[PDB]
């Protein structure tokens, strides 16, 4: 085989935009996102030396910047993660993306089991323990590039009927088993309802890892497959267990029963039907199915000219809402481009040193505003031919449409077991 | 000595007439400037030749005795002849008509007529040894009605027509001067004055002859010249000519003095407002200017000669007569001949040859005999016909042979622009008083005449700077220095800088690849704003890139060039910026749905172009009434982009009320 | 509490071709400050920078690295001439805070520095060296690596003592030429005078004309005038204007025998014209180093406030006779002109009545004529100016500037900090205008109105958006 | 895959000594033989594909402290010393010492090394090969091979025994860590 093919390959291997590699503290490639794991050792051999070079003289490499594309390094006890982006993402955001990849590797196998298998032998190849399960960690970046829950660090609740949500959440609330901690009923990356063990608290990073777990593989759709998962942000020590009933065979509405012991398959799997039955006989199952028929609400419903998209998050509760991104942002590239803009405003209005409470950007493209206060973070995105008066008017009109239609698009009462 | 050595020339077409011989008496009338040649012998055949007169006035009269003096009235209508000691005859002169001589004798019987002065077309004064008698002629009645008179002792008289003043020497020493003016046929008294006498020897009493006084019209003012010869002593400062200012109102004041640095005889003249003096002993001519800065001793202003003494240019009399067939050479007239007599102004008569000349000043030769371009310009800004020679100086001041230092150019331009500014101020004041409602019959409202000195930017652009810039001989830094020096003089005398001067500065600044210089002259507002200048800059976009932007903001500073900004932005493809601009002024309702998104597929984000069509009716749909465009602006044809369309836009809700 | 500001940790210059073989690695380093560092540490830092370049050339072989960030330093690279890399290692701020246990601890504030300020400072170091000492490779072809190293040491070992990175800010990202506002008449008078002089001094080849340390005219090109202006207003004018503030007892003013008929007085070369053996030590600059590569003696002649910079060609050595003649000629003319411009500026300042301090503190820069204006920076000392507003707002302006450049179009970013200070910034028509408004309880529309009002007051003849 | 560290000695084409085997210029300079060169190859060893990731460690005392880190998780350390030089043979018992103190693998007494004697083509040999062989035998039978990096002879078999013994070792690693 002539070197022509390798030349065409490596000449087109570097224009990819979000190269992510994750390697072990020895220099053995754990994960490579857009390249073969074999060549991109030698390269990525460099990647550990550069870290272990600056680690000699009581320092640490933290990032490299060309003009056009950052290169971010992040260190965790058994793994170093390096991300060669090509976007307008400050070093912090790329570090968050890498920390998500790492918390993901933590979810595939416990984080007190990595420290152990790497304190026993630093030679340990980790690409044959978490082998095959790459598309659990290879799509998480795609969700990071299209779905805006990550940049916002909050779960996007489904806009369900005001009362129907209480009925479905009650049907959930009744089926409380002892070997249970959280009961989560999500519908295609959106949170219908949740009931946690009393006086307990979930972390959105864990919820997003479960979102990725489910959306990644297709097995979850056939039948109840009882699987283990560790939620790293909640309890990094030991495993939890959960199983996945995709309730209606045509639609997508999965409930999550995360449990505390491994062989309780039946004691908690009874809760599947003990929950489904009362809901289905209430008739509320039909209203749930109907709301599921169209779970995304467009932006025209707001009745605002010069308005292409928005995000709204309530600091009081911790969830957020957003219409379907549809009008110009349909191409899977423009979707990330728009997504990167709210990333910009979210980082720029949450710089713990210098915080802002109103932004505005009138560019040669979508021109956006970003309001922030004690109760809610409101980010918008207009069409560039929008006067500041029109934007400051839309920012009160939309807020009125939200406060009026709030109880429909949110989850107002936290349900406890 | 070549022609480049003399400056005083004679007339190219002189007046040749029958020479003076004991049979044909010759006289001259300075008032009309006509020479009379009368062949006596009973039938006095009189021929009259003037400078303007195309056909000499030839006629016959009778010999009623010896002719003493002869003069015509104004318009040459009435003839008057003194042939006797007390009786002067007159004839209502109609050519080809027999006229009856009517005789008038002076009122005072024992008064002897020295002559007469045709003060106007119908009034005349008679000067007698014992006074003056002013009458008016009644030709159809053939009588003289005595208007006024005054009896006074007189040595002699002198008359100035253009100022219409008679002057009488009364005292036996002839150093007391009684003047009288005449206006509108009315006599008026002018105050008496006195002439200081120079040191005299104890061999005689110096008598001030008729030939020691003269009258002149210099810069419109009346001056009395007295030729004072410094008698030969060890402190002999040479002879001089004193100009007593004789005002029409007020006392005659000694004002100017002219140093000759010579002794002997002199013949005076006034040519083009200059006082010319000929020293006949050595055949030299000296010109004095009265408005050139002269030595002011706190009392009177003394003036050296302007140029080094020279002789009048040797003249070549054109051959005339029936013998002109043979190849005979021209006759050079005897320069400074003792037969040369002078009459004010600028008239020299030669009886020995019978010629009449009006001395003229050439101006080309003074480009050489006077190098101090400051004084040279101070001198050429007073003479008439000074535009060709001033332009020749200004263009020779920049040739590589005589390239002059820069303060010299600054001073020259300052003087030219002082004249120009004076003319512009006069014209503006005239036009303002004209729109202010003052009539033409007002003696103050006369349109200011643009003299030959005034050199506007058109002249200094056609004759000086265009060829000078295009010659490509001078070091380009010198060229730009001279250009910015002109522009500095202009902007200093508060004149408007014609835009073509700026186009010349830009042409030069770019042709020698000086671009940051253009940037600085644009930034500091030396090349002021315009539409053509903006076009030129924008055209320069290829060589010096920021020029494009340098053009654009120029257009913005115009506030009267919107559509130009719009087309240049469309050219630069800043469609969004053009749109956000036109929506700024207010034309966003009058714009055409065609151009902004027919020039769409050339940037290919068609909602970067179709944000707008619905928006095009988001403003003004209420006026027309349809979701998609109707032929209001032919747009009904221009619905052709909804082919590859993405999403669901598809129409405007046509708000109708 | 301790806030350790940033400070120049190190600076070096290497060339990865020199000493291509091992045992000759020390030949890569052409300069290293401080020089007291152990040789192995020198080669380790040089190896690390060269490794980072060789690394980020794996992903974009045309755009090598531009800065590396760490916990205790940010290291900014630069390649001014082919294979002659410069590196500046700055230290991050430190917050040293006393703990309740009695042990104050250091926290490295990792994200407080702006890449643009210090990359600009590094390119400014190179361009100042280029002005005053040639280029890197021309010096090579002239006299080998030994001459190169000697020139580099002798210049930088002294220059780097005047890099006060503790006070670098946005105005260093700019690097502009603060101009002097003049009308048609005075500016054309200045052109007339400059042409007079240059023609009556036929060896004078280039000219600049500064007033009150604010440029007016510049005969040089554009790239070679900003460096020379920074040099004139940082290292030449302050030292020679300080004696008039230090008094008669100064060791330099005492040897300054002035002239009575004209205030003219040199600033470089023979500074006292009466000592008949005064030396003509004129600084010697290099201009147009790309195409014609000219070497010119720089003669700064300063009247009352104005200051002409004559540039004589290299070989034409000015004799002290030349300097006496030049003073005799220029002194009266330049005194007249300086009095003219001073009177005009005073009268124009009085014509603009004492309106209250304009409540918008702005900053303006024009990417083409490199004009630059600011009312947030107060001249406490003429060498470097010190700001007049909160440091928080300055870092906010830094972040805004860093958010701008990503596309070169008509952009605008408005912001409200938690102190309720409004911060506006526009970038359009190759110009950047940042504004600060201390308007509490405002809204977006009133703030846009205020920026419109300032733009109409000062930049009305300067393209901008509403 | 096998992380193999190749201890050498500066002076013998340290910048062109290893580039015969890997057959490609992946490794050039990135802290390479000024730090450590990084270069890889796939080997067919007992019908199993092994990925040798190769770290040539520069012997420069100025660039040595990076050895504590570069030795983490070593699958085989290969000692390259010159047969024409007696000094790098005297040092052969000091080669293993620093490597065992810094790398510190779990079972050092049996950790696989390989001794390589380069530059056999050059005449005037100073170290009798039997001297190095006796060193190896007294050192718990560390395999040794004579090779010529300018001739590329027999080095393939050196990597062969590397990969075979270290494949035994890596099966052992996976067996212990589970």
Numbering used by the authors:
A (entry chain A): 236 to 652
B (entry chain C): 1 to 657
C (entry chain B): 17 to 482
D (entry chain D): 8 to 185
Question: Would you copy out the relevant sentences from the publication that reported this structure?
Answer:
Rab7A (Ras-related protein Rab-7a), a member of the Rab family of small GTPases, has been demonstrated to be a crucial regulator of mammalian autophagic and endosomal pathways. During mammalian autophagy, Rab7A can facilitate the maturation of autophagosomes and their fusion with lysosomes through its interactions with relevant regulatory proteins and binding partners. Particularly, the GDP (guanosine-5'-diphosphate) -bound inactive Rab7A is reported to be recruited to autophagosomes by its GEF (guanine nucleotide exchange factor) protein, the MON1/CCZ1/C18orf8 complex, which can specifically convert Rab7A to its GTP (guanosine-5'-triphosphate)-bound active state. However, due to the lack of complex structures, how the mammalian MON1 (monensin sensitivity 1)/CCZ1 (calcium caffeine zinc sensitivity 1)/C18orf8 (chromosome 18 open reading frame 8) complex specifically recognizes the GDP-bound inactive Rab7A and achieves its specific GEF activity for Rab7A remains unclear.
Then, based on previous structural studies of the fly Mon1/Ccz1/Bulli complex together with our relevant sequence alignment and Co-IP results, we used the truncated MON1A (235–652) fragment for assembling the MON1A/CCZ1/C18orf8 complex, and subsequently determined the Cryo-EM structure of the MON1A (235–652)/CCZ1 (1–482)/C18orf8 (1–657)/Rab7A (1–181) T22N complex to a 3.41 Å resolution, revealing a unique architecture of the MON1A/CCZ1/C18orf8 complex bound with one Rab7A (1–181) T22N. In the complex structure, both MON1A and CCZ1 are assembled in a triangular manner by three LD (Longin) domains, and directly interact with the C-terminal α-solenoid domain of C18orf8 forming the MON1A/CCZ1/C18orf8 complex. Meanwhile, Rab7A adopts a typical Rab GTPase fold, and packs against a solvent-exposed surface co-assembled by the two LD1 domains of MON1A and CCZ1 to form a triangular-like architecture. Further structural analyses of the binding interface of Rab7A (1–181) T22N with the MON1A/CCZ1/C18orf8 complex revealed that the specific association of Rab7A with the two LD1 domains of MON1A and CCZ1 is mainly mediated by both hydrophobic and hydrophilic interactions. Furthermore, the side chains of K10, N22, T40, T58, Q60, Q67, E68, R79, and D82 together with the main chain carbonyl group of L8 from Rab7A interact with the A261, E273, G262, E260, N358, and D360 residues from MON1A LD1 and the E38, E66, and N56 residues from CCZ1 LD1, forming 10 specific hydrogen bonds. In parallel, the positively charged K31 and R69 from Rab7A couple with the negatively charged E238 from MON1A LD1 and E41 from CCZ1 LD1 to form two pairs of salt bridges, respectively.
